[PDB]
Amino acid sequence: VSEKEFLDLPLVSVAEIVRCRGPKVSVFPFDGTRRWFHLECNPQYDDYQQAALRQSIRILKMLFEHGIETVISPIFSDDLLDRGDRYIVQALEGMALLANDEEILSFYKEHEVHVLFYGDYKKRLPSTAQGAAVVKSFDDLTISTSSNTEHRLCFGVFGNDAAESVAQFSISWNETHGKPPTRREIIEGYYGEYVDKADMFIGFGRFSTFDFPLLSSGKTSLYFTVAPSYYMTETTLRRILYDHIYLRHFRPKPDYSAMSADQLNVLRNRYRAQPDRVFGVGCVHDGIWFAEG
Amino acid sequence: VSEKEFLDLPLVSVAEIVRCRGPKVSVFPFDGTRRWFHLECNPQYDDYQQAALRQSIRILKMLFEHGIETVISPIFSDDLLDRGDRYIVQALEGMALLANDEEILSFYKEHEVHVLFYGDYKKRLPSTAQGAAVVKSFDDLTISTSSNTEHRLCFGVFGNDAAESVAQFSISWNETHGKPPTRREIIEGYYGEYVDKADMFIGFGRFSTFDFPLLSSGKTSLYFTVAPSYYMTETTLRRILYDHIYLRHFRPKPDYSAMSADQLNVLRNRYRADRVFGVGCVHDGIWFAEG
Numbered sequence: 123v124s125e126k127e128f129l130d131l132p133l134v135s136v137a138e139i140v141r142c143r144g145p146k147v148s149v150f151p152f153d154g155t156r157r158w159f160h161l162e163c164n165p166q167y168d169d170y171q172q173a174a175l176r177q178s179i180r181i182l183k184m185l186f187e188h189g190i191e192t193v194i195s196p197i198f199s200d201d202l203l204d205r206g207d208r209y210i211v212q213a214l215e216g217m218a219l220l221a222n223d224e225e226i227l228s229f230y231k232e233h234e235v236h237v238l239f240y241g242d243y244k245k246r247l248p249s250t251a252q253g254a255a256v257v258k259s260f261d262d263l264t265i266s267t268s269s270n271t272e273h274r275l276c277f278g279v280f281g282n283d284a285a286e287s288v289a290q291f292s293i294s295w296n297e298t299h300g301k302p303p304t305r306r307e308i309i310e311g312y313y314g315e316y317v318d319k320a321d322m323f324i325g326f327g328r329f330s331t332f333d334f335p336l337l338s339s340g341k342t343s344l345y346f347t348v349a350p351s352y353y354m355t356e357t358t359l360r361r362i363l364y365d366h367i368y369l370r371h372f373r374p375k376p377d378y379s380a381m382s383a384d385q386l387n388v389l390r391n392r393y394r395a396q397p398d399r400v401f402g403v404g405c406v407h408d409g410i411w412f413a414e415g
Numbered sequence: 416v417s418e419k420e421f422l423d424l425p426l427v428s429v430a431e432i433v434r435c436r437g438p439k440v441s442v443f444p445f446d447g448t449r450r451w452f453h454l455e456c457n458p459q460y461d462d463y464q465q466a467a468l469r470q471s472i473r474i475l476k477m478l479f480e481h482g483i484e485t486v487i488s489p490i491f492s493d494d495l496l497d498r499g500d501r502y503i504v505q506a507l508e509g510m511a512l513l514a515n516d517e518e519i520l521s522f523y524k525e526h527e528v529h530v531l532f533y534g535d536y537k538k539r540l541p542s543t544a545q546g547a548a549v550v551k552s553f554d555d556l557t558i559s560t561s562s563n564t565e566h567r568l569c570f571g572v573f574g575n576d577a578a579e580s581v582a583q584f585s586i587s588w589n590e591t592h593g594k595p596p597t598r599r600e601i602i603e604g605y606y607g608e609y610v611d612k613a614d615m616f617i618g619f620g621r622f623s624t625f626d627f628p629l630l631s632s633g634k635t636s637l638y639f640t641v642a643p644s645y646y647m648t649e650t651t652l653r654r655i656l657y658d659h660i661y662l663r664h665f666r667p668k669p670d671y672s673a674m675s676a677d678q679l680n681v682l683r684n685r686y687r688a689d690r691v692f693g694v695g696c697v698h699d700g701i702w703f704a705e706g
């Protein structure tokens with residue numbers, strides 16, 4: 123099955139393929155959107171939060187339409203890369219939109235998305251009226267979308283450093299059960315439901331991943347877009363899916379004892395000089411980091 | 416300071432720079448060493464475990480000498496990529512070497528390395544006799560290198576999925592202390608000592624990271640070499656270090672509201688021209704990242 127074929131497939135058979143072979147759980151932060159906003163919109167007229175929210179809908183829609191069961195989307199934390207909002211008041215406007223805007227509520231309905239929140243936000247959100255309201259809206263959104271069974275969407279708010287949460291949870295579970303919680307139960311406790319390990323993380327810019335505790339594995343395929351997340355097109359998404367599905371786990375494994383001198387030379391040249399190439403090494407233009415290619 | 420300048424530096428300078436600007440903690444699994452072995456050695460005449468061991472010593476020495484304080488190296492687990500051994504009898508040979516080999520005991524001694532092991536190896540490993548022995552060797556090695564204070568080496572053996580371990584550690588801790596353990600205490604519990612969050616991870620081949628629970632962060636800089644880990648030269652390491660130290664956290668941050676139409680255009684065009692690092696191709700059953 124070739125890449126061009128896969129790009130030529132109608133959406134339905136792609137979603138079938140993904141439902142069979144994964145990725146089942148995908149991590150996708152929306153990074154660099156302030157960059158995107160200053161390049162693709164008019165900051166003098168356009169409303170930042172609405173522009174961003176429209177793109178979040180578009181991308182979530184795209185991911186689910188391609189047959190991805192669960193999306194994990196870090197939204198706000200101390201270690202989020204290229205975050206959507208520098209200051210928490212603006213971030214709280216964004217989160218509120220996530221839990222109250224009619225357009226996105228309609229999206230959750232139309233795509234049967236059940237929406238969960240993870241992280242330390244119940245403690246760490248501002249002890250302000252606004253943060254109280256946001257926490258409330260989160261709880262309400264989890265409730266109002268709880269009849270939706272086709273897709274799971276997990277938003278991460280202070281979704282780094284689960285260690286203390288796991289500890290306290292485990293202590294409680296042991297007190298209430300007489301035995302430690304299994305791994306499964308720990309995951310349910312942190313995310314509100316059981317979620318399988320991530321099959322891919324799609325990042326942007328600097329190679330870095332974050333905010334998906336308990337869900338990371340060496341099997342999680344990692345990608346890093348050159349352009350900020352909201353530049354994501356359906357073709358890009360397909361190149362990533364094709365790579366994860368057919369290329370990252372190609373069979374059969376090569377047998378190097380079976381190789382000709384030529385075959386070893388050919389493979390040696392790829393790895394050997396030239397030279398000492400490492401992906402993730404970059405360069406800086408006008409204060410902006412870009413991976414060298 | 417530029418890439419060329421940094422590369423021209425005396426090692427001692429590079430190391431002082433690393434000592435004060437980081438990476439203080441670096442994750443470096445040794446991956447694809449079987450490809451390397453089939454490409455660079457003679458399997459009919461060369462001993463695999465010894466060749467691998469010698470390369471491990473070379474790279475570890477290189478990292479510690481460049482000023483890095485703690486190296487975390489996944490050795491064996493269920494989610495390692497391009498692992499050193501397909502079967503656990505061989506992997507136990509390698510582990511045994513790490514705790515018992517003359518050359519490497521000498522390495523720990525001369526570079527004042529304290530060596531710890533993390534993961535669920537005490538439960539999984541000693542199903543057999545060889546495993547039980549490896550575990551005792553692990554313990555002995557942690558103890559006999561314990562007065563070394565310059566550098567820390569953590570070898571990962573079944574060092575993924577710490578959740579259950581953290582849970583039991585916390586239950587026990589709370590039972591003996593009357594309060595939950597802090598993050599620091601949890602980290603000390605899992606690794607034996609407190610370890611700061613990883614500042615960088617250096618993989619190989621398929622973009623993936625693994626086997627450093629509790630120590631991963633958005634700030635962990637990630638790198639994936641094209642060639643198997645044992646091909647690493649001092650130049651590669653210096654390019655990596657330079658990127659992490661001076662590029663990944665460039666200041667000052669750009670101000671888009673202060674750019675000219677032309678400046679906005681040039682940047683808009685880099686992004687509008689669609690590439691994804693991590694997308695690859697396959698030659699002869701082997702995956703390579705596309706440039």
Ligand SMILES: O=C(O)c1c(C(=O)O)c(C(=O)O)c(C(=O)O)c(C(=O)O)c1C(=O)O
Pocket residue numbers: 154156157203204205207208668669670671
């Ligand atoms: O301080 C910021 O919030 C910020 C960030 C950031 O995520 O920390 C970035 C960034 O993407 O890393 C940028 C940036 O686009 O480089 C800026 C910026 O406007 O230059 C800021 C910022 O608000 O200053």
Ligand SMILES: O=C(O)c1c(C(=O)O)c(C(=O)O)c(C(=O)O)c(C(=O)O)c1C(=O)O
Pocket residue numbers: 373374375
């Ligand atoms: O789980 C695998 O994907 C797998 C497969 C496979 O294609 O299903 C094979 C195979 O092609 O037979 C093999 C194999 O080498 O026989 C392995 C394997 O290396 O054990 C795997 C696998 O990694 O699980």
Ligand SMILES: O=C(O)c1c(C(=O)O)c(C(=O)O)c(C(=O)O)c(C(=O)O)c1C(=O)O
Pocket residue numbers: 375376377378447449450496497498500501
């Ligand atoms: O089954 C293996 O152990 C294996 C692996 C592996 O780590 O799972 C790899 C690999 O690097 O992914 C390879 C490989 O080099 O691609 C091989 C191989 O010899 O092709 C094997 C293997 O022992 O078959």
